[PDB]
Design a protein around this ligand. Structure first.
Ligand SMILES: CC[C@H]1OC(=O)[C@H](C)[C@@H](O[C@H]2C[C@@](C)(OC)[C@@H](O)[C@H](C)O2)[C@H](C)[C@@H](O[C@@H]2O[C@H](C)C[C@H](N(C)C)[C@H]2O)[C@](C)(O)C[C@@H](C)C(=O)[C@H](C)[C@@H](O)[C@]1(C)O
Lengths: 37, 146, 214, 60, 176
RNA sequence: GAUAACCGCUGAAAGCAUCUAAGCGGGAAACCUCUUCCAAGACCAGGCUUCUCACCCUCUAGGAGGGAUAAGGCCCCCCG
RNA sequence: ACCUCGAUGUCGGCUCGUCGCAUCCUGGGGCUGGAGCAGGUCCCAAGGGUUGGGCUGUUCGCCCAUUAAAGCGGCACGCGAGCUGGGUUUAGAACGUCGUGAGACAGUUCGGUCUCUAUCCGCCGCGCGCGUCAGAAGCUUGAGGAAACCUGUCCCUAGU
């Protein structure tokens, strides 16, 4: 998990979602898994 | 001279409020009004001329938003790091009457008369209370329109 | 659900195990306890059994206690103490006038022994809380056993509650847990409990079944 | 305000209605009526409610 | 509008048993009770399909209606034909057996991992490396299947562990 | 028992739909029970027992003011 | 340069703490830039614990032997009406540099008084008095509090 203030897609597979009042990036590549905090 | 309650002209009345599906703050405001006696034309701020207020179904009080888990009731024991916090939901689960009690007590004035007034509040975490002998009046919280 | 017996700390001694290992055992007179009263959730709101222990003279016993024992149906005894039980079947096991002997425990049973610790009197911080004493030499002026600092400065501005200071120590309830019962002398109504139990010799103790190592 | 809400009217609208009706009884004697003469206070409340506009919240 | 208002085809052998906004649908396989949310009601749409409609249309009623119809369909399907999740175990030495009402796994741990079948859940082992969970409540079936999945921390290297009937796990190969 | 990260639901307000959306269900030492101790001055003071279930006097015969006390307890005394 | 110069005592050490989390164990995600493993880097979730010595005025540090680890800070750089007085900063003296000199020196050194019976709050313990709707008596009963919470190797699992 990449916990940074800014989360963005790192590839075309990454999708930005908002789960539990929190912007996150979900991807088939776990390396690109991000979270806002 | 303005009217002043003398000796035993303070007549007391018993009300019972059903806290089922009622907002905690609204119920506490109405109960504090009744316990102060602000609803009586003979109200004098230095006199405990309020009314007894039973609160039934205190466990079934309603709280909006996330107060049931995000709002905390705090107590410091006087010892270092002795701050215990219990969410409204946990407090309602463990001591259900205590949420309504705390709301009403906080809405009451903090002084000797306020603590005397507290004694007229009877919160119960169920549909029934033991004060049927007092013949309490069912009190529905109704707003006076303008 | 949890056995227990009122007794007296007769003393302490040593026995030897089957492997010839020395076992320091407190000898406790787990004398007969008479069930005087049963606490129930219906009548009392909790489940407990009231036990009475020790021979006392009826002249010594006062009228309120004498009447309580009469209502129980048993002869008055010096001490009375309650054993709390979890469920109602535990008290369904008991009955007033019941005879509780040391045999309720068995050899090898782990018990919790509760007793009133010895009175150490007004103790200093070194004895009472293990405070590191200040230096015996190297300039130390009359602070060899004194607490040292008590608080901070202006910012707390006061001393916190629970500050470990000197005061009366001992004479408090202590429950030593998981003490093995080396032997149950049924003939003498005695228990040899491995280790030490709180209090002076002759003091009232409560030997309950171990709450942890049941 | 206690007497007014017992009469089913707020204090502010009671004062508005009394002013509209031209009743010049000061709050001292209004409270005196509220305590000692609830019937008279109810009569004044009726006067104030009658004098109030058909719609208190109207742009008027 | 229409995809949430899709009538739920109720089969012949079903008794939904409404009592307001709380259904208790019974069928060939067990019974399932659902406390429907605020929006919708139920009148069977005559033909037999539980009608699902929302009173207003802002956002919350929209979502609750879309989910209520979906859950009603899932519930009727579960009570009529049930649900099954077929799962397969990979890894030399990884194995599963059915010990009556419980499922035992050998997944390389020093101990065999036991799984107590919860109410409404039944395990059936087709082979020492293939099994399946079955139940009338697929929420619970999927939950227990997920527990069985998580039994072993993901092995991107060898693929050892449990999976589903068809799953292309995130494999991982490279240097020596 | 309740909680980060990991999930489940049929799958939408939204189309082969989709971790999940709004709703609803499951997985650390921290938290709440659990263990030990204090604790009803917990001003919201429990199940039992003891006497009694008023002994007398005075202003009023309202409300009080004092003795004697039943019950039990101090103080003395021998002590730890 | 806003309180304090009709005085708010300094550094260090001792003693005693208390708090924060900005993590030195306990839970996870990614990397598996371990393809893998023993390990480790990185980022998210305080209960406890977080050693003893030498050289250091030593605030810092370095070193020795350990450790699971030898955390970082706040609290008047916590704590001198609790201690010490090594540093520092009086009065003596020597040397170095400057000065004609008296003397000066964030120069090197030796020596160099640490007062107070606690009134208030606070805290640690003990009582006495009243309450607690009759006057006592044992047994209690948890609202609320406090205490505790640490963690190592070795073996089997498995030379898997
Ligand atoms: C035994 C008997 C004496 O005790 C001492 O000598 C102690 C040991 C001094 O400290 C010794 C030792 C030491 C280190 O103590 C602080 C030192 O600084 C002083 C100069 O001398 C004291 C306390 C000095 O105070 C301190 O003076 C400093 C100038 C400031 C300080 N405070 C205001 C900041 C202040 O309290 C001072 C001047 O003597 C106080 C005045 C009132 C006195 O003269 C009184 C009469 C003293 O003679 C005395 C108390 O009887």
């Amino acid at each position: 998990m990449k916990v940074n203030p800014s989360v963005k897609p790192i590839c075309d597979k990454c999708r930005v979602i908002r789960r539990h009042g929190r912007v996150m990036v979900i991807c088939s590549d776990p390396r690109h898994k991000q979270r806002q905090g | 001279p303005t009217y002043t309650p003398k000796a035993g002209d303070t007549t007391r009345s018993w009300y019972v409020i059903d806290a089922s599906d009622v907002v905690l703050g609204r119920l506490a405001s109405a109960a504090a009004t009744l316990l102060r006696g602000k609803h009586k034309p003979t109200f004098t701020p230095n006199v405990d001329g309020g009314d007894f207020v039973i609160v039934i179904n205190a466990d079934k009080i309603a709280v909006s938003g996330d107060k049931l888990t995000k709002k905390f009731a705090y107590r410091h024991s006087g010892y270092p790091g002795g701050l215990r916090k219990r969410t409204i939901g946990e407090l309602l689960e463990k001591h259900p009457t205590r949420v309504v009690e705390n709301a009403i007590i906080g809405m009451l004035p903090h002084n000797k008369l306020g603590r005397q007034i507290q004694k007229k509040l009877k919160v119960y975490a169920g549909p029934d209370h033991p004060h049927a002998a007092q013949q309490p009046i069912p009190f529905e919280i109704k707003q006076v329109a303008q | 659900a949890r056995k227990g017996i009122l007794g007296t700390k007769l003393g302490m001694t040593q026995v030897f195990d089957e492997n010839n290992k020395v076992v320091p055992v407190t000898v406790v007179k787990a004398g007969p306890n008479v069930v005087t009263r049963i606490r129930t959730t219906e009548r009392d709101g909790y489940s407990a059994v009231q036990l009475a222990y020790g021979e006392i003279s009826p002249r010594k016993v006062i009228k309120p206690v004498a009447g309580q024992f009469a209502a129980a149906g048993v002869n008055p005894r010096r001490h009375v103490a309650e054993l709390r039980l979890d469920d109602e079947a535990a008290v369904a096991e008991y009955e007033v006038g019941q005879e509780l002997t040391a045999e309720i425990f068995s050899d090898g049973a782990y018990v919790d022994v509760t007793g009133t610790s010895k009175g150490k009197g007004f103790a200093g911080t070194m004895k009472r809380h293990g405070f590191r004493g200040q230096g015996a030499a190297h300039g130390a002026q009359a602070v060899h056993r004194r607490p040292g600092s008590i608080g901070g400065c202006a910012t707390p501005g006061r001393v916190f509650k629970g500050t470990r200071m000197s005061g009366r120590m001992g004479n408090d309830r202590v429950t030593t847990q998981n003490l093995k019962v080396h032997k149950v002398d049924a003939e003498n109504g005695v228990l040899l409990i491995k280790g030490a139990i709180p209090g002076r010799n002759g003091g009232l103790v409560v030997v309950r079944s171990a709450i942890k190592r049941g | 305000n206690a007497a007014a809400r017992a009469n089913d009217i707020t204090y502010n609208r009671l004062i508005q209605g009394l002013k509209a009706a031209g009743v010049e009884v000061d709050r001292k004697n209004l409270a005196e009526l509220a305590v000692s003469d609830p019937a008279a206070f109810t009569a004044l409340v009726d006067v104030a409610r009658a004098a109030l506009p058909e719609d208190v919240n109207a742009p008027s | 509008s229409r995809i949430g208002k899709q009538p739920v085809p109720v089969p012949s052998g079903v008794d939904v048993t409404i009592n307001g906004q709380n259904l208790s649908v019974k069928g060939p396989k067990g019974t399932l009770t659902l406390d429907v949310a605020e929006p919708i009601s139920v009148s069977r749409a005559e033909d037999g399909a539980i009608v699902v409609t929302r009173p207003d249309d802002e956002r919350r009623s929209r979502s609750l209606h879309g989910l209520s119809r979906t859950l009603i369909a899932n519930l009727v399907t579960g009570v009529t034909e049930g649900y099954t999740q077929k799962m397969e175990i990979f890894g030399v030495g990884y194995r599963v057996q059915l010990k009556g009402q419980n499922l035992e796994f050998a997944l390389g741990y020093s101990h065999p991992v036991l799984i107590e079948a919860p109410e409404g859940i039944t395990f059936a082992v087709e082979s020492p490396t293939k099994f399946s969970v079955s139940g009338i409540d697929k929420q619970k079936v999927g939950q227990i299947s997920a527990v069985i999945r998580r039994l072993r921390r993901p092995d991107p290297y060898k693929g050892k562990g449990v999976r589903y009937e068809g799953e292309q796990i995130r494999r991982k190969v490279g240097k020596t």
